[PDB]
Design an enzyme around this catalytic site. Structure first.
Site, short mmCIF file in Angstrom:
data_model
loop_
_atom_site.label_atom_id
_atom_site.label_comp_id
_atom_site.label_asym_id
_atom_site.label_seq_id
_atom_site.Cartn_x
_atom_site.Cartn_y
_atom_site.Cartn_z
N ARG D 54 0.80 -1.22 0.00
CA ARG D 54 0.00 0.00 0.00
C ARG D 54 0.84 1.27 0.00
O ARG D 54 0.60 2.21 -0.79
CB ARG D 54 -0.93 0.01 1.23
N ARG D 105 11.23 3.97 3.08
CA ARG D 105 10.87 3.06 4.15
C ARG D 105 12.10 2.20 4.46
O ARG D 105 12.83 1.81 3.55
CB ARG D 105 9.69 2.16 3.76
O1 LIG Z 1 2.84 -3.68 8.39
C1 LIG Z 1 1.83 -3.41 9.12
O2 LIG Z 1 1.23 -4.34 9.72
C2 LIG Z 1 1.33 -2.00 9.30
C3 LIG Z 1 1.89 -1.03 8.29
N1 LIG Z 1 1.38 -1.43 7.01
C4 LIG Z 1 1.56 -0.68 5.82
O3 LIG Z 1 2.21 0.37 5.84
C5 LIG Z 1 0.91 -1.21 4.58
P1 LIG Z 1 2.20 -1.79 3.42
O4 LIG Z 1 3.29 -2.52 4.19
O5 LIG Z 1 1.55 -2.73 2.35
O6 LIG Z 1 2.80 -0.55 2.71
C6 LIG Z 1 3.39 -0.88 8.34
O7 LIG Z 1 3.88 -0.38 9.38
O8 LIG Z 1 4.16 -1.22 7.38
#
Ligand SMILES: O=C(O)C[C@H](NC(=O)CP(=O)(O)O)C(=O)O
Ligand SMILES: O=c1ccn([C@@H]2O[C@H](COP(=O)(O)OP(=O)(O)OP(=O)(O)O)[C@@H](O)[C@H]2O)c(=O)[nH]1
Ligand SMILES: O=c1ccn([C@@H]2O[C@H](COP(=O)(O)OP(=O)(O)OP(=O)(O)O)[C@@H](O)[C@H]2O)c(=O)[nH]1
Ligand SMILES: O=C(O)C[C@H](NC(=O)CP(=O)(O)O)C(=O)O
Ligand SMILES: O=C(O)C[C@H](NC(=O)CP(=O)(O)O)C(=O)O
Ligand SMILES: [Zn+2]
Ligand SMILES: [Zn+2]
Lengths: 143, 310, 143, 310, 310
Positions: D54, D105
């Site tokens: 996401r 990230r």
């Molecule tokens: O991973 C989770 O459970 C919550 C949170 N989720 C997301 O950000 C959605 P994604 O990892 O698909 O980008 C995160 O901190 O990465």
């Protein structure tokens, strides 16, 4: 000036602190007095460590030969010097050094380190009791 | 008791020339007159924490020829040291409550010395500790040099290959230095040279030694040409340029060799000795291997039986 | 007993020696006098360090606050206490502390550590510039 | 310029209520009236050093909806940091010479903060740093709450699951605490509880929170039920007893819910929300995800444009 | 059309001085006056078969700054070459039916040259082929030298580190040799020396070069100090002694440098440049990296446009 205990006099400069670190002399409740970079007369500059109510065996005094060969060790009682001695090179250095051979058994196992000491061409060579390799004392590290 | 009764056998540096001669004399005797029950009621541990073919199998064969029983392992992976995180010290502390002697090989230098500090009254025999010592190799080597040269003094001895990590050459050079008039030629890559503690020992004893770049330089002079394997499992990756044998002996290089000259190698060889050497009268590495039986029988006899044999 | 320099008084027992390591104080040629396990009216036992012709860096007195809050720093000239002070606890400590969060980026990478320090309930809470985690300074005591 | 022009977006702790409201009002307008050339001639780095569906895809889609170009990587394994040993610092030092903003990230806490020390005038947007912060998740979270509840004040908010490692709830709780009269319910295993630094912040602001061992205890009272995944990739092995969701929401648990209540989850879910929840009027995690587009567009527009006029 | 229109850019050896000057003059104008739609309706392949941070990201950013679209991959593992056994030849044969130019980096020497035999009328741009060539690095290198030194003639240029496997210095040395009166200083471990084919080229052009075992020997004389990383992924295991940087530059080594001197490094660095160098006026590796944008924009514009008018 102390009443009773040991005065390590004529320690060369920059050595006093190392001796404190290495033989863990400060790990006691006894009063300790340290002079560093003091003026001498026979040496010019010197370090000095006094420890109350604490005595050094001849072996302990010999362990200093590695770092302060020309040091003087005054045993003291009732404010009097009741004995004076000098480091003579010891046969062994135990516990304080770490064998620099990474494949030696002494690193992995619950034993104390141990090196045989010998004079070698204006250097001191250390031979590990276990792995039997030999090193300049310069490259054998502490801990 | 004989001089070696109940003694630890850790390093050639701890043995005198008289000790070495004692083993050899005993080896001769038992070769001529086997005593198949000399060690009956002995149980001996054979504990190999790194690989072996000759040393472990000759040692165990020796124990049986003398009537002793054998327990142990050829791999540490299924000991409690291998799977449960036990120290070597605790391993020796328990095994030494079981057996009459411990034969051990280990990948760390000093393992055998360490074991003696936990084995109580049980003698430890060093079958090799890292790149340090291999005293039983030296014993069979000496027996072999004696058998083929008629003596252990005043010899010309070349040692070739990995001298830095050769526990065999550390022990053997120390042993031969205990005899008179021996001459050493060291043929090694600079990176795998004989260690300074060996050279210092020689200088101190007034022994002649020299560095050489080729086998051919010394071929006409040498009585013993001791070939070694590059100890690749001991190498630092910084020394990986030396994995390949730098010196390869073939049958053709033996032309100007003395008729008494024997080629030795503690084995295994990789390519440092070509198979064409095998058939020449100078080849003696297999004969040498077989002599391990007589050296190891002798050592076991002297350590475990208090009386001198006959 | 010196003419110009610094006297760190009221150092708690077993801290004096730890201060000499960290602040590299014995890496000078200046005269140094050290008393360990000295009697104290206020503290019972204490350590004491005298450095001639030398004064602390402001980070060292900042660093001094968490090691020895009750310590006392005297500046001396002409054999006179011309300056006396108690270590002021800053709000930021850089470079000498290690974050106890093993997954903190500060371990892997070439940046200087940095903590926000504030008094909290009983102990001191130290908050990392990077991972934003907060810790008792007793946890940042060892590293 | 607007308060967020050329600002790093690292932690909710550095943002005011006014800042958060600015992103929300901007997100509402972009959802209503899109600006497809707003970021024309911008090139933005999307640098993900750990997995994402996401956050990365909504971020890159948002860039494209605004007319910007995108460069980067979703895996660090083929970067020079992955194969040639380069530091993150040098990595940021060079990428910051190429692009107009950096979205990152990273598996270590602090990485985004560190990046700001090497990026010069290039804004860094924290898409998640270890278990620390997730500011853009909070932006879309707040946007979704505002949308469904009509407010960000006087809410009853339950947060369920792994609260210790949930960077999502660290950021969300800090944000909601900048508003008035919110009440929190923390439903978590004791080993994965909400960190004390969060609670201390709640205390010094006089905000009511309480711990609960069951969703049922709070179902009838909550406006927002915020479910989380156990962050197994962050667990210490000593915490492996908690790998399985402790609290499982299903459709039957919703019988006493407030009609207006929404179930949120930053996603992905494993088992903590059963699929029978998806068809109920309370399920809103996919609509929430959808809102990532408008929050992230909003943030990008505010950081890279001096002024926006609706 | 311009001399470089529709030309493959494989090796510095195929380029004239005039060609290099053309890219440099074009890079200067684009840095001053950007052309954001220059490559509109172009689609360019970015095909990296080994790791990259700068080369790939600057290349793709450059494409975007010029208005082109980008397709490709940073890892070959999910291509049909990676999973279904396809040849590089077939891979180039099909991608050349899709795109207007191909940017490729590959772990084998020759791959870019080979690609030209299958790409038909589609220009191939060599982003690095094994330890052979790195022409676009040289382009940005030359641009950076020109910028800081005001010239490409009569320079004193030191190249330090792994010169054997450094495709960077193979290309750079060939380029600088097309100019007049340059002098080279090669500071390298003997095992990683500058290849003889480079030296032979220097000789037949009457260009002065010399070998040195220390940066200090040349610090006071050099205009450009070009540091390199040891290319460990290319080392033979026999060369593992050289894995560690032999020459480490720190800020203190710069005391006798010429004021105008710049420290370059194509990056990434491991330990050959200490971080205390970064704050000195001599550090210029990040500015150099930054220049990748203008050199690569310049090259793309010249290969894909018949004529450019400032
Ligand atoms: O991973 C989770 O459970 C919550 C949170 N989720 C997301 O950000 C959605 P994604 O990892 O698909 O980008 C995160 O901190 O990465
Ligand atoms: O408690 C203390 C403090 C200081 N000192 C100091 O030790 C130093 C030694 O002074 P000394 O008078 O004891 O010896 P010396 O210097 O004349 O001769 P050598 O020792 O070189 O053989 C002097 O500077 C003195 O002030 C102590 O001996 N004890
Ligand atoms: O410069 C000094 C100061 C003090 N001291 C030593 O410190 C001891 C304490 O004597 P002090 O007078 O210096 O301190 P104190 O007793 O008043 O106790 P505090 O409340 O100040 O902590 C004395 O016994 C003396 O031996 C020194 O050796 N040198
Ligand atoms: O391994 C060698 O090359 C020499 C020597 N070889 C032997 O002892 C024979 P083995 O390993 O088969 O017991 C050793 O040091 O272990
Ligand atoms: O890798 C090097 O050390 C030099 C040189 N470096 C680069 O091109 C930079 P990057 O690998 O990040 O694209 C290379 O030949 O790949
Ligand atoms: Zn050792
Ligand atoms: Zn931290």
């Amino acid at each position: 000036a102390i009443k009773r205990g040991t005065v390590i006099d004529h320690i060369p400069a920059q050595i006093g602190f190392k001796l404190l670190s290495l033989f863990k002399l400060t790990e006691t409740d006894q009063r300790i007095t340290i002079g560093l970079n003091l003026p001498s007369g026979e040496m010019g500059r010197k370090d000095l460590i006094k420890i109350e109510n604490t005595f050094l065996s001849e072996d302990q005094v010999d362990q200093l030969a590695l770092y302060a060969p020309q040091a003087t060790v005054n045993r003291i009682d009732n404010y009097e010097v009741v004995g004076k001695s000098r480091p003579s090179l010891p046969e062994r250095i135990d516990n304080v050094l770490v064998c620099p051979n990474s494949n030696c058994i002494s690193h992995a196992e619950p034993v104390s380190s141990s090196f045989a000491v010998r004079k070698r061409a204006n250097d001191i060579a250390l031979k590990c009791k276990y792995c039997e390799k030999e090193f300049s004392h310069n490259v054998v590290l502490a801990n | 008791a004989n001089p070696l009764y109940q003694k630890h056998i850790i390093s050639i540096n701890d043995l005198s020339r008289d000790d070495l001669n004692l083993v050899l004399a005993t080896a001769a005797k038992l070769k001529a007159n086997p005593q198949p029950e000399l060690l009956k009621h002995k149980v001996i541990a054979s504990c190999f924490f790194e690989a072996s073919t000759r040393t472990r199998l000759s040692f165990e064969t020796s124990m049986h020829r003398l009537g002793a029983s054998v327990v142990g392992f050829s791999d540490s992976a299924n000991t409690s040291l291998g799977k449960k995180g036990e120290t070597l010290a605790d391993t020796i502390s328990v095994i030494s409550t079981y057996v009459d002697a411990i034969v051990m090989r280990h990948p760390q230098e000093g393992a055998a010395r360490l074991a003696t500090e936990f084995s109580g009254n049980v003698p430890v025999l060093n079958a090799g500790d890292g790149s340090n010592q291999h005293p039983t190799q030296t014993l069979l080597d000496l027996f072999t040099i004696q058998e083929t040269q008629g003596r252990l003094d005043n010899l010309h001895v070349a040692m070739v290959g990995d001298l830095k990590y050769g526990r065999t050459v550390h022990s053997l050079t120390q042993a031969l230095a205990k005899f008179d008039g021996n001459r050493f030629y060291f043929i090694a890559p600079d990176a795998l040279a004989m260690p300074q503690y060996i050279l210092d020992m020689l200088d101190e004893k007034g022994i002649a030694w020299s560095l050489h770049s080729s086998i051919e330089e010394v071929m006409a002079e040498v009585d013993i040409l001791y070939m070694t394997r590059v100890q690749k499992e001991r190498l630092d990756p910084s020394e990986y340029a030396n994995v390949k044998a730098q010196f390869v002996l073939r049958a053709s290089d033996l032309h100007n060799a003395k008729a008494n000259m024997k080629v030795l190698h503690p084995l295994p060889r990789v390519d440092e000795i070509a198979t064409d050497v095998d058939k020449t009268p100078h080849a003696w590495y297999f004969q040498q291997a077989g002599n391990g039986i007589f050296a190891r029988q002798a050592l076991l006899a002297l350590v475990l039986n208090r009386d001198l044999v006959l």
